[PDB]
Amino acid sequence: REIVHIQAGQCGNQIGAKFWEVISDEHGIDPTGSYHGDSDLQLERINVYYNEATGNKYVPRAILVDLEPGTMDSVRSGPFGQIFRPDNFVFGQSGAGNNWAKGHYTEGAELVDSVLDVVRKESESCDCLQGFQLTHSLGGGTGSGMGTLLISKIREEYPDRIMNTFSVMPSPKVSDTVVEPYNATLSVHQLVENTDETYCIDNEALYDICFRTLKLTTPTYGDLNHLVSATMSGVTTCLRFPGQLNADLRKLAVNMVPFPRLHFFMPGFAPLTSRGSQYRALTVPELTQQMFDSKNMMAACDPRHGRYLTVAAIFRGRMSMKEVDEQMLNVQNKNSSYFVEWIPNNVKTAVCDIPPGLKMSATFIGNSTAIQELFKRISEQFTAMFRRKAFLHWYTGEGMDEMEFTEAESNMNDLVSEYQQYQDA
Amino acid sequence: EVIELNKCTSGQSWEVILKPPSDPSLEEIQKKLEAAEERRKYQEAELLKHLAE
Amino acid sequence: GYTFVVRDENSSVYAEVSRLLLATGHWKRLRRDNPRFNLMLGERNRLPFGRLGHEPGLVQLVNYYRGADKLCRKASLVKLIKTSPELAESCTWFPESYVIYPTDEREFFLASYNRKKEDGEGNVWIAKSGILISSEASELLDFIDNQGQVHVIQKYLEHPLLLEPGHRKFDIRSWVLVDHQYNIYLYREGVLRTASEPYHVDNFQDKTCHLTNHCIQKEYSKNYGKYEEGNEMFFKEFNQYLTSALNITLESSILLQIKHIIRNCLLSVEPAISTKHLPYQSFQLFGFDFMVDEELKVWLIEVNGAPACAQKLYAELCQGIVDIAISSVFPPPDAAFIKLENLYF
Amino acid sequence: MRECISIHVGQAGVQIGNACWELYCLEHGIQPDGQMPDSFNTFFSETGKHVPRAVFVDLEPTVIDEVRTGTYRQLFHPEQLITGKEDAANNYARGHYTIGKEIIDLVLDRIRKLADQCTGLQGFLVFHSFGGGTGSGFTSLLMERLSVDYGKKSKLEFSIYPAPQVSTAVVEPYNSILTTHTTLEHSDCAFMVDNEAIYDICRRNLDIERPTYTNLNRLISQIVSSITASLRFDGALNVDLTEFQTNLVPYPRIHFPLATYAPVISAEKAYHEQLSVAEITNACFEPANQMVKCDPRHGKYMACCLLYRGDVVPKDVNAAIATIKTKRSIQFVDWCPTGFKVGINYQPPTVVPGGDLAKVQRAVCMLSNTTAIAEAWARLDHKFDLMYAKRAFVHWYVGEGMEEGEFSEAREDMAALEKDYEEVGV
Numbered sequence A: 001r002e003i004v005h006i007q008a009g010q011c012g013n014q015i016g017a018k019f020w021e022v023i024s025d026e027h028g029i030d031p032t033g034s035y036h037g038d039s040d041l042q043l044e045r046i047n048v049y050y051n052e053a054t055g056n057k058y059v060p061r062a063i064l065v066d067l068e069p070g071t072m073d074s075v076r077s078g079p080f081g082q083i084f085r086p087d088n089f090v091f092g093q094s095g096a097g098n099n100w101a102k103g104h105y106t107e108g109a110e111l112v113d114s115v116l117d118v119v120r121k122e123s124e125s126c127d128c129l130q131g132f133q134l135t136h137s138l139g140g141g142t143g144s145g146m147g148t149l150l151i152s153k154i155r156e157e158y159p160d161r162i163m164n165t166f167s168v169m170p171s172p173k174v175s176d177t178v179v180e181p182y183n184a185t186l187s188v189h190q191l192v193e194n195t196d197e198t199y200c201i202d203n204e205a206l207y208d209i210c211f212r213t214l215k216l217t218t219p220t221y222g223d224l225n226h227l228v229s230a231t232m233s234g235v236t237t238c239l240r241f242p243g244q245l246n247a248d249l250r251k252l253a254v255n256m257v258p259f260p261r262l263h264f265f266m267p268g269f270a271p272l273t274s275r276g277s278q279y280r281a282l283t284v285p286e287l288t289q290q291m292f293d294s295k296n297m298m299a300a301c302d303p304r305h306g307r308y309l310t311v312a313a314i315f316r317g318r319m320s321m322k323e324v325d326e327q328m329l330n331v332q333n334k335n336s337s338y339f340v341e342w343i344p345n346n347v348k349t350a351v352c353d354i355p356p357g358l359k360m361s362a363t364f365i366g367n368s369t370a371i372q373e374l375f376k377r378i379s380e381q382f383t384a385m386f387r388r389k390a391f392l393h394w395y396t397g398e399g400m401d402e403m404e405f406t407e408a409e410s411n412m413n414d415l416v417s418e419y420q421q422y423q424d425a
Numbered sequence B: 001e002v003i004e005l006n007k008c009t010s011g012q013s014w015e016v017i018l019k020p021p022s023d024p025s026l027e028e029i030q031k032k033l034e035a036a037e038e039r040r041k042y043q044e045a046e047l048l049k050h051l052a053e
Numbered sequence C: 001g002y003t004f005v006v007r008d009e010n011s012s013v014y015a016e017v018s019r020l021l022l023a024t025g026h027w028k029r030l031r032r033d034n035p036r037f038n039l040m041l042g043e044r045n046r047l048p049f050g051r052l053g054h055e056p057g058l059v060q061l062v063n064y065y066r067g068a069d070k071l072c073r074k075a076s077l078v079k080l081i082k083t084s085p086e087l088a089e090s091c092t093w094f095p096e097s098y099v100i101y102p103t104d105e106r107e108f109f110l111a112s113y114n115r116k117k118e119d120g121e122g123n124v125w126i127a128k129s130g131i132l133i134s135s136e137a138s139e140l141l142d143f144i145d146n147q148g149q150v151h152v153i154q155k156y157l158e159h160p161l162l163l164e165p166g167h168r169k170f171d172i173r174s175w176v177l178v179d180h181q182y183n184i185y186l187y188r189e190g191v192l193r194t195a196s197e198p199y200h201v202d203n204f205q206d207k208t209c210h211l212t213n214h215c216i217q218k219e220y221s222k223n224y225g226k227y228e229e230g231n232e233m234f235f236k237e238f239n240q241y242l243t244s245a246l247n248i249t250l251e252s253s254i255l256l257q258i259k260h261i262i263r264n265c266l267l268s269v270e271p272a273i274s275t276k277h278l279p280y281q282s283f284q285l286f287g288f289d290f291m292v293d294e295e296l297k298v299w300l301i302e303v304n305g306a307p308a309c310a311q312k313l314y315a316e317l318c319q320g321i322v323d324i325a326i327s328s329v330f331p332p333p334d335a336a337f338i339k340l341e342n343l344y345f
Numbered sequence D: 001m002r003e004c005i006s007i008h009v010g011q012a013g014v015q016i017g018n019a020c021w022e023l024y025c026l027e028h029g030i031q032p033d034g035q036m037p038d039s040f041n042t043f044f045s046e047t048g049k050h051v052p053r054a055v056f057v058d059l060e061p062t063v064i065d066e067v068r069t070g071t072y073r074q075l076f077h078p079e080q081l082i083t084g085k086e087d088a089a090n091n092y093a094r095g096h097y098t099i100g101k102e103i104i105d106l107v108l109d110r111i112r113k114l115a116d117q118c119t120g121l122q123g124f125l126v127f128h129s130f131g132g133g134t135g136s137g138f139t140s141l142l143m144e145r146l147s148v149d150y151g152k153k154s155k156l157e158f159s160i161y162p163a164p165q166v167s168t169a170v171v172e173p174y175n176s177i178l179t180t181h182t183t184l185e186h187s188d189c190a191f192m193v194d195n196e197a198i199y200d201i202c203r204r205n206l207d208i209e210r211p212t213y214t215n216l217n218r219l220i221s222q223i224v225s226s227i228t229a230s231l232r233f234d235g236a237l238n239v240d241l242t243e244f245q246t247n248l249v250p251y252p253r254i255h256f257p258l259a260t261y262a263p264v265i266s267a268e269k270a271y272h273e274q275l276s277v278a279e280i281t282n283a284c285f286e287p288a289n290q291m292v293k294c295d296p297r298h299g300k301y302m303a304c305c306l307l308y309r310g311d312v313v314p315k316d317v318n319a320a321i322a323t324i325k326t327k328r329s330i331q332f333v334d335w336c337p338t339g340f341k342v343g344i345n346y347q348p349p350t351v352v353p354g355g356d357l358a359k360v361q362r363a364v365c366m367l368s369n370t371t372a373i374a375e376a377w378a379r380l381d382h383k384f385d386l387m388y389a390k391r392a393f394v395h396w397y398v399g400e401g402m403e404e405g406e407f408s409e410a411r412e413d414m415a416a417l418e419k420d421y422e423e424v425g426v
């Protein structure tokens, strides 16, 4: 059961490169692609993310996309840069200028067919393809515009497969341009229609965690990417190691998505580490309380402001399964109002013996109605500019029409009202 | 307490009474299966049509 | 902290219990269909016991004991007294009763009626589903055949203890709360549903003197509330009448027999209704109805699964249900009920 | 002769199947290679090697691959182990329609190959879960086709009832109602195994902190062995599949007997001074020992069958039954004889060496058709109602070709089933 990984744009390639470095270490794969691990329980499901090449080499089933060579040249030089298939680097020369329209309609449309040729080649060499996972940001131009363009084209060619994304939401606290609410709203509109599951990784939440919790006053993208790669590792553990719960993308979607449009997940992680941090190993009760706390959410939403439709918890490392079950049952009994009563047993728990890194950790995946706070924040920012048609010339100049913006704004407002409807049920 | 012994080989059985009282055809399945198959094919066609637009 | 559901709005007792739970900052009331509750104040009939205690980690308690109907139904109580090993030979406090269908213990009733007629013994019987008091088997059986559903022909006491002044019939109602650990608690205060008409032997059709039913007295007794408000005498006034007129205390002449009957009744059905071996816990408030004869002998008449309290006792009884049955299972952060026990411990 | 073909569908059916055949081999002195240094021929065929008359089916290979490479790899013929590539993703619609249609004909052919080696086939024993997409979906498709291809043959079920402690999907209530509805007409007798009841028995009686599937399956296998012992040993009660139907099934729809097994003792315990008849017979009426969580005290009996194994003599059984009646809540329906059908197999119970269960001198499995089992339907139906009211997850089924109509049709049938148990039970 193979997954085809695609990473697009600066953010998509930076978080994507970290994800591959992290899991390559976990699976005992070195930068040359050779296996040198101390367990085989690393190679049991290695084929989910890696292909097997000539001299017993494991090659990531990853496709690196960007309209600018810069970020991809940085990857090719980084630690695990040589692990990727050289043919799978697909890049243009004229970037996207943080413009969704350029990535989706003009610059991106010129490069998209060559990317699909690589996607097709990777798919044809799959015994049984489960689907695709895309890493990207929604505030830029390549990952946002060209990424959603790729999703649309892939869906047309593989309508019966799962489309999963790790989508980095933009925030004024960690911003590159004022047009981020435009790019994000346009991308969310695409995501609501063409993805089965999206992990909402909020830069606002990643910033507040680094600043308020870790006390990293003046955090860098590297600091935010430390949390991201750790969360990405946790949420994909069930797909990379032998397990019974959410072992593939489809079963995960069936367990987590009660309504087709409501597929935006709020990840959580514990303990919150800081690059090069100190000594203790968090008890099971401590892991559980933290992963459910607003301060550990990777989306800037207060779960106490909504209700959980479904939840998937994953514990990693050697620990008491009896204690895990007691702690998991306790969080629900102590906060039963924040879990919808009309979805019985909506909190599932998995445990993996192999820890990340750390001695023991816990990853949370929640489909909460509080996620509307993220879409409300973006919608507010989008409307503040769209109301006065600010910066629209950059988009209309690429061929886009104002009607397209009105539809994206409306679809996202509908998404918010749908999340609110199920919160009042 | 009525008892009724029946057969005895590698063990034995009996009954004790305390108190007396007071097809779809093969075609029929195939039609439903194909009816669902067409609904699947149709929904996929509607999606691809919407993507073509 | 804790959550509760109310699935019986007609219950006056648990409506007050609900208010008391809400009066503290520990209880929240959920919609009646919500299954994520801690306490369930369930419905009288067809309560979903099968669904209880299956929500993991959640501790669930219900205001009813499943199977209590084998004691609280008129025909099943007669069946229990006559067939339970704990009661069949030892029961001297239940009037001679026979189940009558329009099993059918009709043949046995006629044999007992004919034995009392020939020996010159008292032969007045009462039939209840619609209540007929008569000394004629022919008249009694015909009454049953006219109505549908099962009647029970019980021996009519004939010589009851009459309250003076007025020379009037009365019945005692006692409230018993059995908690999650099957601890039987008798509520200190009882009520005497008295009649406001002088009692006379024979006639029987004067329902104001023969039937002490509160609704019968309110609608047909011309002297309703003449001796005491709402025809309800309390244990202080009754103990004072007993110690004065008959020179004996209520807690010796009548309450000892009452306590004995309650413990025998609830413990005969204990193995069939005990929630130790069930995923949920049960508790129930019962209404024991007694009748005292002229020799000061207490007779059990009926047991009520969903009883109604006396207006002035509602506050104390409902607080006792909250403290003993609810707060024992669900405790909050920081002598009106006698616990009935065996002579030996 | 009278042969019996076992069909193990999905992960639960396969993994439970592995445990049963491991036990049957120990009980019949059959080695993992099939060598055995007759009644057992209803379950095993002979070569020159004793091969199980079983078929293992799953829409994904990983679980059946463990059988193909495990200790009992030699036991089965390769054609008996059938696997697909893509599972039903905990979706009844994928198992019954999308993926089921693709593999059904191959399965029926492999089954036909077993039927062709039978002089006088009795019927089938189908093992599957209610919650899995294959266990629920593919099984009901298989049962539908078997009723066509084998008209008058009996079909018994061992159905794994969902429990949150081990549940892998939120939609298990949906799959359970859908499969129960579709399979109802095609199953002659079904033994539900509540994973919650097995889970608690493992914790309470075997002192297992957090039971695994291996722990659950070994206890399940013991109960399954007691039920099928009569078919594998000359035994005088329940000698054929038809007998299960006639001794326990008063009405075609009311075919779900409650199984209670005792004693369940920890292998390390040591304080055990062997339980007697009447001690073990009494345990059959303790809710803590039932395979399905319910209160038989508040349910009417339509049948009661006691299956003893080991050192048991009739005198003890009769004395035990006599006392039990006077101290228990055994109420039968007014339209049935208040009697117990007893069977004794002198073959003592076998345990897996290095297992959690202690070896005993005597044991008993009670099969009773009580209206109390309808509590299990009520719990499932309530969970179905909670989600279906909001149409939660329904899009996953509709997306595979199903219609909302099938959901309400299956639920209406379950409502009728709950009412049928109510009518009988008063």
Ligand SMILES: Nc1nc2c(ncn2[C@@H]2O[C@H](COP(=O)(O)OP(=O)(O)OP(=O)(O)O)[C@@H](O)[C@H]2O)c(=O)[nH]1
Residues within 6 Å of the ligand: D009, D010, D011, D012, D013, D015, D016, D058, D059, D087, D088, D089, D090, D091, D095, D128, D129, D130, D131, D132, D133, D134, D135, D136, D160, D161, D162, D163, D166, D167, D168, D172, D195, D213, D214, D216, D217, D220
């Ligand atoms: N007792 C027991 N239950 C099991 C076992 N394996 C799975 N289950 C239960 O079966 C249900 C899930 O169905 P499975 O049989 O695993 O699924 P499947 O038939 O493979 O279906 P798909 O994966 O959807 O194709 C859950 O309720 C599990 O707890 C097992 O070995 N023993």
Ligand SMILES: Nc1ncnc2c1ncn2[C@@H]1O[C@H](COP(=O)(O)OP(=O)(O)CP(=O)(O)O)[C@@H](O)[C@H]1O
Residues within 6 Å of the ligand: C095, C126, C128, C129, C131, C154, C155, C156, C157, C158, C170, C171, C210, C211, C212, C213, C289, C291, C301, C302
């Ligand atoms: N055996 C008996 N001897 C004397 N009086 C009796 C009697 N059985 C009943 N009574 C009288 O009849 C009244 C009603 O008795 P019953 O047992 O029918 O009442 P209940 O409260 O159970 C309900 P219902 O309204 O259906 O009568 C009693 O309160 C009592 O006054």
Ligand SMILES: Nc1nc2c(ncn2[C@@H]2O[C@H](COP(=O)(O)OP(=O)(O)O)[C@@H](O)[C@H]2O)c(=O)[nH]1
Residues within 6 Å of the ligand: A008, A009, A010, A011, A012, A014, A015, A096, A097, A098, A099, A137, A138, A139, A140, A141, A142, A143, A144, A168, A169, A170, A171, A174, A175, A176, A180, A203, A221, A224, A225, A228
């Ligand atoms: N977490 C994270 N966010 C990033 C990173 N780089 C850019 N971003 C965010 O992504 C958006 C810009 O998109 P980017 O990937 O730079 O541009 P693209 O080349 O057009 O896809 C903004 O919202 C940034 O805050 C990164 O490495 N990590």
Ligand SMILES: [Mg+2]
Residues within 6 Å of the ligand: A008, A009, A010, A011, A012, A013, A135, A136, A137, A138, A140, A142, A143, A144
């Ligand atoms: Mg990007």
Ligand SMILES: [Mg+2]
Residues within 6 Å of the ligand: A009, A011, A136, A137, A138, A139, A140, A141, A142, A143, A144, A145
């Ligand atoms: Mg971008």
Ligand SMILES: [Mg+2]
Residues within 6 Å of the ligand: D010, D011, D060, D087, D132, D134
């Ligand atoms: Mg499976």
